[PDB]
Design a protein around this ligand. Structure first.
Ligand SMILES: NC(=O)C1=CN([C@@H]2O[C@H](COP(=O)(O)OP(=O)(O)OC[C@H]3O[C@@H](n4cnc5c(N)ncnc54)[C@H](OP(=O)(O)O)[C@@H]3O)[C@@H](O)[C@H]2O)C=CC1
Ligand SMILES: O=C(O)CCC(=O)C(=O)O
Ligand SMILES: [N+]
Length: 418
């Protein structure tokens, strides 16, 4: 990464607090995670040896309620990345008005080198390590990069075993399989929220999205579903997709299902029939109408900020654009959906699932879809009007919408007097 993920996040927070009335003590409180837990996660490998990984559970603030955030399994992960993600989580849950704080977890591991049994052991050992700081009313993890509902169910089972079934164990973690307390629409949650935000942004810009072009970076749970929903709901034409090994571009358009099948049968989207192999750098520079980065953070910097040619940049990923790059893009007249507003659908449906678990009652697809649409539209329009009234960068406006709420919570708790 170009710069430290946490330093960048703090930079953004200050840059955006320059447009609002907030006390110095509150800013100092908000620039530091409230609790960080670094743990050793020992598991037994398939050959019988014991290997110790490094796990992080960072909650940045819980003024508004129990902290929420996914668990990332990544070899390149660092504690700074988890801190930045928890900080972004805070604003993410504040902007769509959820009774959550901000949290994040992670393990420095390459899951592609682990078997099924090793992955289950890793999840259970991580739960055993961080049990003392998580709970249905303390900290609610969720799926993230290289984690899936399978691992979520393993973690929930381990937590329930430790907790001796005293309370709503199903609510300790979200993104679970439907059989063990799952939620309908959670699989396509972040993609649905991103699609709703893109539709609202096009409405604001007066652009008909039918027949237009979308380029998606990353083909995971968010990128693939974003491409599929854009092709299906918005009528867009997916011209290029990518994963860590490279991307495929096609002027005539790609079918997301065939690309996903090829990726599953080959390991990557590279060399897909009828498409041209390109790099992620080349995909980011393509002439498209919507660009959706749904991969690792910090993909747009001063090394390519001026080469972006998309009308709308939908930051599906967490912090994919640097503040400098934000300034360059805004100078270029490119509308940006802020990272913690565009992909707030995923946590929006995660909040729904938590409510369904603690209540003991479950809803349907239509209710979840309706509530998610309502929440995402309200949050996006709040941020848009905020940035329009104050004549500031989108990113900043969302902060003004988010941080203020968090700020209010502290003033309602007595944490900060001013
Ligand atoms: N996970 C979630 O539920 C949510 C996560 N987010 C945020 O979004 C981002 C993506 O999450 P998600 O879609 O679930 O990821 P996934 O866990 O579903 O899978 C990761 C995908 O992105 C690819 N990828 C990782 N790094 C790069 C890279 N440097 N360049 C190109 N492709 C890369 C992977 O490639 P390959 O398959 O080849 O390994 C894979 O295709 C994260 O930052 C996450 O925090 C937002 C909403 C909710
Ligand atoms: O769904 C959740 O609770 C966490 C969402 C998440 O991991 C993210 O927004 O990066
Ligand atoms: N989310």
């Amino acid at each position: 990464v170009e710069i430290d993920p946490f330093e960048m996040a703090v930079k953004q927070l200050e840059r955006a607090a320059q447009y609002m009335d907030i006390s110095e003590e509150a800013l100092e409180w908000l620039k530091k995670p409230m609790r960080i837990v670094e743990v050793s996660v020992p598991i037994e490998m398939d050959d019988g040896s014991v290997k110790v990984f490094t796990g992080f559970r960072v909650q940045h603030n819980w003024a508004r309620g129990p902290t929420k955030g996914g668990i990332r399994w990544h070899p390149a992960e660092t504690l700074s990345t988890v801190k930045a993600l928890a900080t972004w989580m805070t604003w993410k849950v504040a902007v769509v008005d959820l009774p959550y704080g901000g949290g994040k977890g992670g393990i420095i591991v390459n899951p592609k080198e682990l078997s099924e049994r090793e992955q289950e052991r890793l999840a259970r050992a991580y739960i055993r390590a961080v049990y003392d700081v998580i709970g249905p009313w303390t900290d609610i993890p969720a799926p993230d990069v290289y984690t899936n509902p399978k691992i979520m169910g393993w973690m929930m089972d381990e937590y329930e075993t430790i907790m001796r079934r005293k309370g709503p164990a199903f609510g300790v973690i979200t993104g679970k399989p439907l059989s063990i307390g799952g939620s309908l629409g959670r699989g396509t949650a972040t993609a649905q929220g991103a699609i709703f935000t893109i539709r609202e942004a096009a409405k604001a810009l007066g652009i008909d999205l039918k027949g237009k072009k979308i380029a998606v970076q990353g083909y995971g749970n968010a990128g693939y579903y974003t491409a599929k929903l854009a092709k299906e709901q918005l009528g867009m034409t997916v011209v290029a997709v990518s994963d860590s090994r490279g991307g495929i571009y096609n002027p005539d358009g790609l079918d997301p299902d065939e690309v996903l099948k090829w990726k599953r049968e080959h390991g990557s989207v590279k060399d897909f029939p009828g498409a041209t192999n390109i790099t992620n750098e080349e995909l980011l520079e393509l002439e498209v109408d919507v660009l959706a980065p749904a991969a690792i953070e910090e993909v747009i910097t001063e090394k390519n900020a001026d080469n972006i040619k998309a009308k709308i940049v939908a930051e599906v990923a967490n912090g994919p654009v640097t503040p400098e790059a934000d300034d360059i893009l805004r100078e270029k007249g490119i509308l940006q959906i802020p990272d913690f507003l565009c992909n707030a659908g995923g946590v929006t449906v995660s909040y729904f699932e938590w409510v369904q678990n603690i209540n003991g009652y479950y809803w349907t697809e239509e209710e979840v879809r309706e509530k998610l649409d309502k929440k995402m539209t309200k949050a996006f329009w709040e941020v848009y009007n905020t940035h329009k009234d104050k004549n500031i960068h989108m990113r900043d406006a969302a902060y003004v919408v988010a941080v203020s709420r968090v700020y209010q919570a502290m003033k309602d708790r007595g944490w900060v007097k001013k």
